[PDB]
Each structure stands twice: as C-alpha cells, then as structure tokens.
Design a protein around this ligand. Structure first.
Ligand SMILES: CC(=O)N[C@@H]1[C@@H](O)[C@@H](O)[C@@H](CO)O[C@H]1O
Ligand SMILES: CC(=O)N[C@@H]1[C@@H](O)[C@@H](O)[C@@H](CO)O[C@H]1O
Ligand SMILES: CC(=O)N[C@@H]1[C@@H](O)[C@@H](O)[C@@H](CO)O[C@H]1O
Ligand SMILES: CC(=O)N[C@@H]1[C@@H](O)[C@@H](O)[C@@H](CO)O[C@H]1O
Ligand SMILES: [Ca+2]
Ligand SMILES: [Ca+2]
Ligand SMILES: [Ca+2]
Ligand SMILES: [Ca+2]
Ligand SMILES: [Ca+2]
Ligand SMILES: [Ca+2]
Ligand SMILES: [Ca+2]
Ligand SMILES: [Ca+2]
Ligand SMILES: [Ca+2]
Ligand SMILES: [Cl-]
Ligand SMILES: [Cl-]
Ligand SMILES: [Cl-]
Lengths: 154, 154, 154
C-alpha cells in the first residue's frame, strides 16, 4: 500500500533529521562550543573583509562580533591572530554598526583608534574593524586581509 | 507517476543515509578516533558532574571511563586539564561503580585517595572521581566543576 | 492528499540535502580547509601503507599527495610527525608514481634518498614514501607504520 510506504518514509526522514541534528551538536561540542554560549570558529585563512562576509554567509553564520569582554576574549583565542570583527562604519563615517544591524553596544579600541587613516595608500580611509593579539581593536582598510572568524548562535 | 516518484525518494533517502554515515565517519576521524577503538571528546568546559552526565547523554555518549592505563592516558591528553570520570560511589559509599553499572576493573588512585572528604565545605563528602596530576585519580564533590569529556564506542 | 504528501516529502528531502551540505562545509572549514584549496586531515594514528590507503578510501579521499612546496608544508603541519604520502614505486621499481595515477613530478627527497634499502629486515626493499618532520622525503617499507593523513578535493 502506497500510503503505508509513504508513512514509513516520513518516519525514515524524521530519523535522519534527528541524526543530522546530533551530528551538528557533537561537531559544535568538539569545536569548543560552551553550553548556552555563542560558537566561534576559523579555518585560519586571512582575507579581505568582503571575502569573510561572503564566507561566513556561505556557512549560514556571520562575521564574529563580541558583545562584551568575554566574547571578545573567546574570539581572540579562536583566531589566535588578527581577525576582522562584524563591525564597520562604511555607511556613515564615524558611526560604527554591526553587519547584522545596530549601533555599538560595546567596544574596546586602542588608545589612538579609530583614526580612519588615509595614509595606508590602499586608497580611501579605514571603515573596517579588526582585533589585534592583545584584544584591542583598530579600524583598518576593508581591502586588507585578516583572519576569518565566523560566529553561530548559542 | 506516483509510484515512480515514491521509488525515487526511497533511493534519495538511502543515498542521504549513506552520506550522513560518511560524514560521521570523517568527523570521528578528525576528532582523533583510532581504528576499532573508543574515542574521547571534550569542549573544554568545566561543569558539575550532573551537567557532564546530562551533556554526554544528549550527545548519545557516556561520561569518559578509563578501562586501562592506555585509555586513562588518552582521556588525559584530550582533557589536558582535570576531568570527571564516569565513576562514582553515590549508590553505596565506599563502593565505586561505573555510571554504566558494575564494579571497577582498573583504577589509578592517588595515594591517600579516595577519602570522602567533608572539609571542602560544599556539603556531603566526595562521591565523584576526576583525574589530577600524573593521571592519578581523586574522589571529589560531584558539585565541583571539572572538564566534561564524553566517550563514544569503538 | 497522496500527491500533497509526496510533494512535502520532496521538500523535506531537499532541505535535508541542503543542511547536510552546510554541515560538510562547516566541518571542512573547522578542519582548516582554505578557499579553493584541497585539505588534509589526520586522526594521528600510525599504520602500514595499505591500511592508510583503505582508510582514506573509505572516507572518500586519498592518501595525502604534495604537488608543490606549499602543500608539502600543509601536510607536515597537519601530520606533525612522519606520515605516508600517496606516492610509491610498487608498480615499477625506481619509477615513482601517484597512487591516483601518473609519474612523480614535484619531489622533495632527503639527501641520498630514495635508495630502495633492504637492510631494514622487514623483507623486500622500500617502495613507499613518507614525509619526515622537516618536510623532506624518504622511501621506506610499505610495512612500516606511519601517520595516516588523507586529502580531500579543493
Ligand atoms: C594594524 C594597525 O594598528 N594599523 C594602524 C592603521 O590603521 C592606522 O591607524 C595607523 C595610523 O596612521 O596606525 C596603524 O598602527
Ligand atoms: C579502516 C578504519 O578503521 N576505518 C574507520 C572508519 O570506518 C570510521 O569508523 C572512522 C571514524 O572516524 O575511523 C576509521 O578508523
Ligand atoms: C584535588 C584534590 O586532590 N583534592 C583533595 C580533596 O579531595 C581531599 O582528598 C583533600 C584531603 O585533605 O586532599 C585534596 O588534595
Ligand atoms: C626514516 C629513514 O630515513 N629511514 C632511512 C631508510 O629508509 C634507509 O634509507 C636507511 C639507509 O641506511 O637510512 C634511513 O635513514
Ligand atoms: Ca569611510
Ligand atoms: Ca571610517
Ligand atoms: Ca586605524
Ligand atoms: Ca535526484
Ligand atoms: Ca564517597
Ligand atoms: Ca578526595
Ligand atoms: Ca515539515
Ligand atoms: Ca623501491
Ligand atoms: Ca630509504
Ligand atoms: Cl575601508
Ligand atoms: Cl559528592
Ligand atoms: Cl615496500
């Protein structure tokens, strides 16, 4: 009976969806996702901010954005080196915003940053945000390549 | 038509089952699973024993259990820090058992341990086991937060 | 309703396919795959050449093959120790070839290697190739256990 066959296949599909969910949970765990916390990950590849957004978006995630001191540190430990944050002031110079929308609710710039420096030569100012090794931020050219770090929801 | 479509979906479903199986195999390989052997995984998060148990169960695994000096070492190397073991004497004081049931067949107790100490001031004695320095065992309060290490079948 | 149920099943299957692809992409990313580049993975297990071959085959990959200095470095980075490469002269002594076909082009032989040595006492000469710590190559017995490193398509 086709109806029975169809019911059995719906049950098979539900089982596969449950197993894929488990595969995803285990993978996050193995990659360090802490209970109820956001998950940050990197392949350690350095690239232009435009490439990072495309990359994370292709992964159905978003460029890493620290909403406090903790998350900033986490993003720091995963990248291990200088990485772009999902923050820019490209739309309106001076007003930094999250790539997912909204004005900054937390920051940790460096003593003389942001300076929107134009002396970099790459043309234009500096509208992208990246982290250093000490955790401090610096506005740099989006054209410059830095470590790609994506984030996924808690 | 209908029966043809139904037969194809049967093929689609079986192909997806094989693909997810392959995905799990590769993930275990990248997590360091050795051929024909059980493997351990951690997210390096510290938490009370009750939480570790709940988390590993959610992952369809169990709390890490060393059955010999080899696995004991393996767990050590995966955790890097102090981690809980799936061994407790909660059912019968002084009689340590595997959370999966049964008496111990291998132990690596530190001298002067277990001692069911009440001096930690957390209440109750010590009914949980965790690995300390040199890979030795110590009984501690199930309330203390240690590294969660889950175990998956060979 | 039969047709409607079948149509929903089609959609469920397609969304599952989509999600699995996303899982595979994220996993490769987390394992270090660089954009447009093939990537190397290992479980850090040491085994004879035939075992490495069977393992990578089961995972739908091949034994790691350095096609240039850059990939040779990526492989030594991943392995962290001595590992077999998908290169042998089993078919025709002295004529090294890729396990996937074709004669060897790029090479990084250690001084005085290959030498098809028999003094190792394992029987026969040396028809398998492995990378050492420094990245240089040596021909050794396919019977010796070396680290398993598999590569997957760019
Ligand atoms: C990596 C970094 O800090 N780059 C900054 C650059 O963005 C600019 O602010 C410049 C001032 O002319 O100083 C540099 O240190
Ligand atoms: C030859 C062999 O053992 N292959 C297994 C493979 O089937 C799969 O179980 C994988 C899990 O990561 O581990 C490998 O060791
Ligand atoms: C981490 C650890 O080993 N803690 C133990 C504690 O459980 C208890 O046995 C105490 C006895 O005073 O000694 C400590 O060293
Ligand atoms: C790991 C390694 O390099 N083994 C080589 C061996 O293959 C053989 O060439 C021998 C010659 O005596 O030298 C060894 O160093
Ligand atoms: Ca600007
Ligand atoms: Ca700017
Ligand atoms: Ca700047
Ligand atoms: Ca099809
Ligand atoms: Ca006790
Ligand atoms: Ca104790
Ligand atoms: Ca549905
Ligand atoms: Ca030879
Ligand atoms: Ca040799
Ligand atoms: Cl810019
Ligand atoms: Cl306790
Ligand atoms: Cl050989």
């Amino acid at each position: 009976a086709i109806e029975v066959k169809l019911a059995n296949m719906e049950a098979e599909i539900n089982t596969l969806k449950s197993k894929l969910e488990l595969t995803n949970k285990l993978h996050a765990f193995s990659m360090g996702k802490k209970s109820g916390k956001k998950f940050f990950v990197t392949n350690h590849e350095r690239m232009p901010f435009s490439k990072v957004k495309a990359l994370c978006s292709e992964l159905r995630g978003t460029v890493a954005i620290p909403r406090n001191a903790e998350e900033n540190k986490a993003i720091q430990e995963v990248a291990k080196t200088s990485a772009f944050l999902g923050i820019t002031d490209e739309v309106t110079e001076g007003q930094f915003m999250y790539v997912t929308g909204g004005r900054l609710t937390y920051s940790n710039w460096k003593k003389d940053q942001p300076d929107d420096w134009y002396g970099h030569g790459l043309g234009g100012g500096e509208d992208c945000v990246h982290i250093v090794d000490n955790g401090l931020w610096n506005d740099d050219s989006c054209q410059r390549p830095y470590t790609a770090v994506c984030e996924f929801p808690a």
